[PDB]
Amino acid sequence: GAMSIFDKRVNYKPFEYPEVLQFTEAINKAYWVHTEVDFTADTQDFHAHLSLAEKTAVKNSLLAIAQIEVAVKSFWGNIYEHFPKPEFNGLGSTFAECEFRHSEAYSRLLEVLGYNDEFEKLLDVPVIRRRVDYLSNVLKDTKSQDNRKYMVSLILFSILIENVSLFSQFAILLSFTRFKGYMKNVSNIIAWTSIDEQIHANGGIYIINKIREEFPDYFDEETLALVRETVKDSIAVESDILDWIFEEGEIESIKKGDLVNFMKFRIDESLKQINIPVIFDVKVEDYKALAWFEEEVFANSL
Amino acid sequence: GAMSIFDKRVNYKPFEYPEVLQFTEAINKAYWVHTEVDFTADTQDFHAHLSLAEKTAVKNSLLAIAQIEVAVKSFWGNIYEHFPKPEFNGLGSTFAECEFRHSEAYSRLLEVLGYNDEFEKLLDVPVIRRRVDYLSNVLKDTKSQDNRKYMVSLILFSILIENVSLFSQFAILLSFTRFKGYMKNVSNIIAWTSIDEQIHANGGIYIINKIREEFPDYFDEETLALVRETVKDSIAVESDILDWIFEEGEIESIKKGDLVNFMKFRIDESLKQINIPVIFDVKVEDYKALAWFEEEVFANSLDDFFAK
Numbered sequence: 001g002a003m004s005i006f007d008k009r010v011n012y013k014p015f016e017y018p019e020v021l022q023f024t025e026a027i028n029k030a031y032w033v034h035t036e037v038d039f040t041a042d043t044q045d046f047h048a049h050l051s052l053a054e055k056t057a058v059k060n061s062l063l064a065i066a067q068i069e070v071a072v073k074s075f076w077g078n079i080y081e082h083f084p085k086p087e088f089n090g091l092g093s094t095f096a097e098c099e100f101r102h103s104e105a106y107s108r109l110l111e112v113l114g115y116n117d118e119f120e121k122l123l124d125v126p127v128i129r130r131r132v133d134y135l136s137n138v139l140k141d142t143k144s145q146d147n148r149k150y151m152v153s154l155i156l157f158s159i160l161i162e163n164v165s166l167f168s169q170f171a172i173l174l175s176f177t178r179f180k181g182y183m184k185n186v187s188n189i190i191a192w193t194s195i196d197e198q199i200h201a202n203g204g205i206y207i208i209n210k211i212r213e214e215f216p217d218y219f220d221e222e223t224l225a226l227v228r229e230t231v232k233d234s235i236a237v238e239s240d241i242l243d244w245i246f247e248e249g250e251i252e253s254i255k256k257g258d259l260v261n262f263m264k265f266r267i268d269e270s271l272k273q274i275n276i277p278v279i280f281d282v283k284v285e286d287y288k289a290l291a292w293f294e295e296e297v298f299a300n301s302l
Numbered sequence: 303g304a305m306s307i308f309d310k311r312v313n314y315k316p317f318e319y320p321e322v323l324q325f326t327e328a329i330n331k332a333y334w335v336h337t338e339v340d341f342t343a344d345t346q347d348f349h350a351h352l353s354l355a356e357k358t359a360v361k362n363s364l365l366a367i368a369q370i371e372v373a374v375k376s377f378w379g380n381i382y383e384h385f386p387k388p389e390f391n392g393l394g395s396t397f398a399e400c401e402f403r404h405s406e407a408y409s410r411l412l413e414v415l416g417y418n419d420e421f422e423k424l425l426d427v428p429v430i431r432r433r434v435d436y437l438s439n440v441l442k443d444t445k446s447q448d449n450r451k452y453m454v455s456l457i458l459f460s461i462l463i464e465n466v467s468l469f470s471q472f473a474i475l476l477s478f479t480r481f482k483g484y485m486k487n488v489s490n491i492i493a494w495t496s497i498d499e500q501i502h503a504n505g506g507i508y509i510i511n512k513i514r515e516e517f518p519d520y521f522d523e524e525t526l527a528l529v530r531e532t533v534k535d536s537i538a539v540e541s542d543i544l545d546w547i548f549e550e551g552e553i554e555s556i557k558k559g560d561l562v563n564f565m566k567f568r569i570d571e572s573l574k575q576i577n578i579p580v581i582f583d584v585k586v587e588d589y590k591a592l593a594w595f596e597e598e599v600f601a602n603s604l605d606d607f608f609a610k
């Protein structure tokens with residue numbers, strides 16, 4: 001059979017998948033650590049200027065982010081086990097190192113704002129448990145030796161972990177800087193993280209599309225239906241998380257309904273990129289509510 | 303049994319091994335890539351100003367470095383499988399990413415100087431085959447679940463692959479910049495690599511000493527004897543590699559004999575740091591010859607943010 005992404009190549013170069021360097025180069029240019037940032041102004045703003053509803057939203061957003069980011073994340077560091085090419089060990093290790101810079105950043109934020117205790121007991125929160133049990137279950141095949149099962153796990157990983165499960169919280173936190181001028185340093189971290197995650201998702205999409213090019217029959221009706229139904233179930237889970245984030249009431253800078261449409265639009269954009277039929281078909285008026293997101297990310301990255 | 307470095311800890315913090323962050327922060331602060339660096343003047347130096355003996359010493363040194371660096375290197379990225387702590391997944395992943403920056407840097411150098419053909423046929427060189435055969439023994443237990451065997455693989459990996467195998471070649475290349483002002487940007491790459499590799503070696507040493515603290519009986523006479531004899535055999539291989547590097551004759555900027563003592567000194571210093579008896583006992587006047595190595599590396603790494 002013809003050489004494929006699953007087959008070992010021994011020689012370093014030429015790369016069979018040279019576009020890998022577009023993603024590693026993007027990470028290189030965006031390289032950042034949290035020690036570059038002082039949160040004294042943000043802590044003061046948090047305690048002195050934010051309402052109870054705003055304090056709760058900020059706290060629960062960061063706790064939700066940390067549930068994903070403050071962890072040992074082995075996926076990217078292991079893609080070479082499935083795609084045994086020098087360039088994918090490179091891509092994998094590059095993204096793996098990023099995740100440690102992320103875990104350290106969000107661990108510091110938890111320390112600085114005084115939420116280590118609440119983070120430690122976060123599995124007491126039922127909506128978090130459901131997200132964990134959802135994510136555990138649907139991403140079970142990230143360690144499968146079966147390449148078809150693994151491909152599906154990569155689709156879901158790229159959609160859920162690198163996008164759906166984070167970006168609503170990123171949006172919430174950036175909204176405080178955009179509309180109220182608060183949490184500027186926290187928003188620095190959030191903006192840099194969102195840039196990295198977008199690169200991670202885009203790298204995932206790249207790999208998925210290469211597998212599709214090489215093995216079109218992996219993308220049969222049964223597999224497409226599994227992905228779509230699994231992705232649908234994320235909405236319920238993440239929508240309940242927003243109810244918990246806003247458990248002390250709605251806030252001025254951002255609204256839940258717009259965040260739900262934001263999530264749905266981002267899902268559909270990812271599905272189109274991998275030739276899977278859209279699920280939600282969000283109307284322009286609805287997803288434009290948070291169209292400021294990209295602009296604000298760019299602003300707080302500088 | 304008490305919690306050890308080999309036992310899984312689930313919670314992220316506090317770290318049981320917080321000194322990990324000294325190593326990751328050092329790598330973070332030194333972060334560099336090859337992509338903004340250009341070698342037009344270096345290539346002109348190479349062709350216009352170097353004798354055949356110097357050209358060949360440079361070429362063969364780069365080929366020897368590339369033999370180790372231009373490869374898929376999985377060790378660091380897998381230390382979490384052996385030390386299942388969040389901080390060691392962090393250390394491992396940080397050092398793993400570094401190795402891809404290195405492989406890309408040396409792949410670029412091979413291209414720029416036109417050595418791709420020779421690199422592809424490098425196993426035709428007997429001393430290189432001997433090095434591969436020998437490195438295969440350092441790496442042989444690096445996937446072992448036997449923690450004593452894995453520990454020995456880590457010792458050999460740290461003191462040979464990270465702190466010695468490359469350093470004679472780094473010194474050769476730096477000597478052209480130090481003594482004649484040539485090949486400045488190649489020396490930038492070399493110096494930045496040397497800094498990273500030293501951090502890798504020191505991170506390995508840190509781990510080895512934690513294992514020694516927790517499991518003193520792993521360092522029994524049998525184990526010490528194996529390490530010391532394995533390391534001795536390395537010298538012979540690397541000394542032969544030097545004969546090949548300088549096959550066209552001795553050059554002005556650096557001497558083979560000094561490089562051998564430099565290597566022996568570096569080995570013994572590493573062995574002392576992990577409480578293993580020294581092997582070579584190198585004279586003060588002998589290791590003084592390449593005492594400049596550290597300060598040249600430091601000099602070539604100063605204020606290079608935009609270059610990096």
Ligand SMILES: [Mg+2]
Nearest residue numbers: 077078379380
């Ligand atoms: Mg691995």
Ligand SMILES: [Mg+2]
Nearest residue numbers: 308383384447
């Ligand atoms: Mg074990």
Ligand SMILES: [Mn+2]
Nearest residue numbers: 069099102197
């Ligand atoms: Mn992340």
Ligand SMILES: [Mn+2]
Nearest residue numbers: 161162197200
């Ligand atoms: Mn990610």
Ligand SMILES: [Mn+2]
Nearest residue numbers: 371401404499
């Ligand atoms: Mn290296």
Ligand SMILES: [Mn+2]
Nearest residue numbers: 464498499502
């Ligand atoms: Mn190294």
